[PDB]
Amino acid sequence: TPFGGSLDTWAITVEERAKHDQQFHSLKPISGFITGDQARNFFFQSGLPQPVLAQIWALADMNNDGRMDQVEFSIAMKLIKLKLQGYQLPSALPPVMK
Ligand SMILES: [Ca+2]
């Protein structure tokens, strides 16, 4: 956009979240969590540069606890898609994504 994004750029839709939840389930979370290493290993399958994925991890791990639940995973998946589409990552997690 002319404005660096639209109403829909950083928001996660119901459909997107349903897809993310399916992918999260495929990782066999334990009591709703995957480890940081598990998450980052999965993300590496996107093709994105490691430095980029490191930034995405830090954005998505909202509570800074080093592990990842379903909400955080959805956020990471949205950021990965945006980066693949050629958007720049934000310096902090957009509130609309939470
Ligand atoms: Ca976390």
User: Which contacts qualify for 16-20: CB closer than 8 Å, 24 or more apart?
Assistant: 16/74, 16/77, 16/78, 17/74, 19/77, 20/70, 20/73, 20/74, 20/77, 20/78
| Six token digits for residue 31 | 């009591």
Going by the DSSP 8-state scheme, the letter that residue 12 receives in this structure is P
User: Where residue 23 sits, what CATH number does that domain have?
Assistant: 1.10.238.10
- With beta carbons less than 8 A apart as the criterion, state whether 32 and 69 touch: yes
How many structural domains comprise the chain?
1
Q: Is 8 marked as a binding-site residue?
A: no
- With beta carbons less than 8 A apart as the criterion, state whether 70 and 24 touch: yes
- Number of Cβ within a 10 Å radius of residue 16: 14
Distance in Å, CA 47 to ligand 1 centroid: 23
Distance CA(52)–CA(24), nearest Å, equals 20
56: left (phi over 0), alpha (psi -120 to 50) or beta: alpha
Distance in Å, CA 5 to ligand 1 centroid: 26
Measure CA 12 to chain center.
10
The label of the residue with tokens 């994105």 reads: 48
> CB-based burial of residue 27 (10 Å sphere; 0-12 exposed, 13-18 middle, 19+ buried)?
middle
The label of the residue with tokens 């997690």 reads: 93
Resolution of the experimental model in angstroms, please? 1.5
- Give the residue numbers spanning the domain of 24: 1-98
- With beta carbons less than 8 A apart as the criterion, state whether 86 and 5 touch: no
| Six token digits for residue 39 | 């998450």
- With beta carbons less than 8 A apart as the criterion, state whether 61 and 43 touch: no
The end-to-end CA distance of the chain, in Å, is 22
Distance in Å, CA 67 to ligand 1 centroid: 4
Question: Residue 71 is inside which H or E element, if any?
Answer: helix 70-84
